[PDB]
mmCIF file of C-alpha atoms in Angstrom:
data_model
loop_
_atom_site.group_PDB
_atom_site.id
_atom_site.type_symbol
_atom_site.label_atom_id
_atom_site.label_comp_id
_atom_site.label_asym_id
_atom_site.label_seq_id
_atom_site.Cartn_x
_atom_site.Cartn_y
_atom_site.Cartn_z
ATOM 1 C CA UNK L 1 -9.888 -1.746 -11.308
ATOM 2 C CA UNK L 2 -10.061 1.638 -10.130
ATOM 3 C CA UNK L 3 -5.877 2.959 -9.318
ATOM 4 C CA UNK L 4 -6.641 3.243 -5.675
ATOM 5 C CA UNK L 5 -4.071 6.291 -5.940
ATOM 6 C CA UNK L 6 -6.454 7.810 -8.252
ATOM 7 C CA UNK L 7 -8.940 8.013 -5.560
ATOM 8 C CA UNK L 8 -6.727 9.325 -3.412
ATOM 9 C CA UNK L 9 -5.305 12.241 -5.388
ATOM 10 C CA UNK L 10 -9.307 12.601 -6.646
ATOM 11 C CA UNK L 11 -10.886 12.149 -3.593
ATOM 12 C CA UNK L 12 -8.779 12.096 -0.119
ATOM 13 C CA UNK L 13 -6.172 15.189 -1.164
ATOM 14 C CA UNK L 14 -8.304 16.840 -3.930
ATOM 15 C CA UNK L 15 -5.224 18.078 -4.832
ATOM 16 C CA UNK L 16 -1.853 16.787 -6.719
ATOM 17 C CA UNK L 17 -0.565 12.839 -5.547
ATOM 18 C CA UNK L 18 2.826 11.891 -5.298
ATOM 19 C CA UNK L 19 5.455 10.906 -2.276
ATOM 20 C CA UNK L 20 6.629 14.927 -2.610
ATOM 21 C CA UNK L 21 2.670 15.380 -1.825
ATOM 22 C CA UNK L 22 1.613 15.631 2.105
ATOM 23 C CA UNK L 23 -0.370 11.797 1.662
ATOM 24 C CA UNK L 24 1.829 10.639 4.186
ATOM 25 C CA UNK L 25 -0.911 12.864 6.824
ATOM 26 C CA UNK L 26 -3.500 11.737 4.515
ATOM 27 C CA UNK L 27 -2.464 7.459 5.188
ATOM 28 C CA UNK L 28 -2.369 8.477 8.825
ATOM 29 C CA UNK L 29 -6.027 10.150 8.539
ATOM 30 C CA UNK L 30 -7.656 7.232 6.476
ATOM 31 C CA UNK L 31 -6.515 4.277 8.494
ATOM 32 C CA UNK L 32 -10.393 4.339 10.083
ATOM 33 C CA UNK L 33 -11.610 5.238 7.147
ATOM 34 C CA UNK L 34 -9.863 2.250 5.099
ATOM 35 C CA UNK L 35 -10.696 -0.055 8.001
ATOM 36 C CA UNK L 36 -12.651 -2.660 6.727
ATOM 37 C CA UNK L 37 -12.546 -2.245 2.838
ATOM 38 C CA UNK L 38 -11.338 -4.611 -0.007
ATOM 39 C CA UNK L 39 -8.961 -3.657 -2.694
ATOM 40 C CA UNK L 40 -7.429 -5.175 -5.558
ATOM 41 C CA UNK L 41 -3.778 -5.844 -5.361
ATOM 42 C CA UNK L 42 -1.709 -5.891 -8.892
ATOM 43 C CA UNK L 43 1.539 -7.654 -7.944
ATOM 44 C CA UNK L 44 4.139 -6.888 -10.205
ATOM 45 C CA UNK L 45 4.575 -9.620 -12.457
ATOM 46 C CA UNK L 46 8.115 -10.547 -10.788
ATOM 47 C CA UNK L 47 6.058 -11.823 -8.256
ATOM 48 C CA UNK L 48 4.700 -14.073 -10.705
ATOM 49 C CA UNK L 49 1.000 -13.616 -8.826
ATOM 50 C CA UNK L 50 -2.912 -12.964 -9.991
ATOM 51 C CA UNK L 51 -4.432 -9.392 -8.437
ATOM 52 C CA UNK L 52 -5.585 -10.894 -5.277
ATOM 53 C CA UNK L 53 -8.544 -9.052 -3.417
ATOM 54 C CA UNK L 54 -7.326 -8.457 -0.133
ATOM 55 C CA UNK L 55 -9.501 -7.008 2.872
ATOM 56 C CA UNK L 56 -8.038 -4.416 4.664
ATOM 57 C CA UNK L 57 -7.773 -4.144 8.150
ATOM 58 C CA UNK L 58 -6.470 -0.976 7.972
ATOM 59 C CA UNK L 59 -2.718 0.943 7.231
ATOM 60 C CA UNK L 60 0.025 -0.047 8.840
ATOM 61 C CA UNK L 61 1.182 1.771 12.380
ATOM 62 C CA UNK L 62 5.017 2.674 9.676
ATOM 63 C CA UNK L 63 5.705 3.805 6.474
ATOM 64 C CA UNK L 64 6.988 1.039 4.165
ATOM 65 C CA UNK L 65 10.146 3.272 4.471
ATOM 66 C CA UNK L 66 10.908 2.006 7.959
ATOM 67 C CA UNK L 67 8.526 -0.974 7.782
ATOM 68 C CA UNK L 68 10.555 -4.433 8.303
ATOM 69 C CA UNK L 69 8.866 -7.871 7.707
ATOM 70 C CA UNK L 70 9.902 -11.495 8.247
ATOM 71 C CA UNK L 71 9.904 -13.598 5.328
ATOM 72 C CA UNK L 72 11.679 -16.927 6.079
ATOM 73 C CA UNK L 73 13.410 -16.137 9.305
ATOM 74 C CA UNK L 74 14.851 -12.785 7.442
ATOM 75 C CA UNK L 75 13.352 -9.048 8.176
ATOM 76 C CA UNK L 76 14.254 -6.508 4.834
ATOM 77 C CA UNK L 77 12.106 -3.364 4.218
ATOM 78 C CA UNK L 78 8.879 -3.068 1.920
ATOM 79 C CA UNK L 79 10.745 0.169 -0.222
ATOM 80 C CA UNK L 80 14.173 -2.194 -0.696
ATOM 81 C CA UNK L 81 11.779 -5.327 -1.580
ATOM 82 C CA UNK L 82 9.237 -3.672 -4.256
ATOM 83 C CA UNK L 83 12.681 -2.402 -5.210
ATOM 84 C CA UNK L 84 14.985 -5.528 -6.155
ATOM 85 C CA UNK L 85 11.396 -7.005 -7.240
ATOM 86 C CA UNK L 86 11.769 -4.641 -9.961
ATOM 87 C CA UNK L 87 8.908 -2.462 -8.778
ATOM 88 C CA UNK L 88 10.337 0.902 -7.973
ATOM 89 C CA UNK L 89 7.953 2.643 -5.132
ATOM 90 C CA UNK L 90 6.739 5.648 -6.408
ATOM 91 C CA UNK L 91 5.071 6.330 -2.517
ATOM 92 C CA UNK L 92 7.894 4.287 -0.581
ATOM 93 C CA UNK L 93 8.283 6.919 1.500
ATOM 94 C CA UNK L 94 4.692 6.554 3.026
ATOM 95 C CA UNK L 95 2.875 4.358 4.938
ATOM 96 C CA UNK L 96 1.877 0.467 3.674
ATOM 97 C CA UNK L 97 -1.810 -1.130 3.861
ATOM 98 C CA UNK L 98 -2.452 -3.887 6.316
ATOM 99 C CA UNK L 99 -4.394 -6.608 4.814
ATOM 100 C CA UNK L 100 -4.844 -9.952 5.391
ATOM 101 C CA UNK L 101 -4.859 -10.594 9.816
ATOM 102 C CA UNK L 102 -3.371 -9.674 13.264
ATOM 103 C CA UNK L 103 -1.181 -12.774 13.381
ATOM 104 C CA UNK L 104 -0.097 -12.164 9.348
ATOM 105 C CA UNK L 105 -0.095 -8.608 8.195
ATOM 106 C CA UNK L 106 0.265 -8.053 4.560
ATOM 107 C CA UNK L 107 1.841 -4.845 4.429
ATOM 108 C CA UNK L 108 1.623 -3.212 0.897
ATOM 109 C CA UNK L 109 2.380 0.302 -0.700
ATOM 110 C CA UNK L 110 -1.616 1.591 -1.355
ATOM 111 C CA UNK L 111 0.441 2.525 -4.890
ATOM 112 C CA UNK L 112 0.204 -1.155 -5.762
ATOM 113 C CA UNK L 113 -3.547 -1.427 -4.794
ATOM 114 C CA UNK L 114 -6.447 -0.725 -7.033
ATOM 115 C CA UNK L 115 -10.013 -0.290 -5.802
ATOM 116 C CA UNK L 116 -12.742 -2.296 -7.295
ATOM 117 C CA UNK L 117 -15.750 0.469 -8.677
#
């Protein structure tokens, strides 16, 4: 598993990664470009889950900053929930993948996705 935020600091910046880095332009730039891949995802292990390859339908249209879900009737942001999972965001500030489908989204932080070489 290849630290999908190796490839981008490598590859989509060439330059320095980090949330104090401009990859928040970058996310916005790749969505095509990340339409239609597969990455590994490495839960945490608070999650208590197996890296699960998820294909990605592309980045989600809000950073996980601002990005609300619904899990079990309740809506709490992806940067609070990586957070109190025990998994502090190092890019919460940016924008989440979209894997999974239109009528579920899995959003997830591409810091927490790896991409298989």
């Amino acid at each position: 598993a290849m630290p999908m935020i190796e490839y981008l600091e490598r590859f989509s910046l060439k330059a320095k990664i980090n949330n104090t880095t401009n990859l928040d332009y970058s996310r916005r730039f790749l969505e095509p470009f990340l339409r239609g891949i597969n990455v590994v995802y490495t839960p945490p292990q608070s999650f208590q889950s197996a890296p699960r390859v998820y294909r990605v339908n592309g980045l989600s249209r809000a950073p996980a900053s601002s990005e609300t879900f619904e899990h079990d009737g309740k809506k709490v942001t992806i940067a609070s929930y990586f957070h109190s999972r025990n998994y502090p965001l190092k890019f919460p500030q940016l924008h989440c993948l979209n894997v999974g489908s239109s009528i579920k989204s899995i959003l997830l932080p591409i810091e927490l996705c790896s991409i298989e070489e």
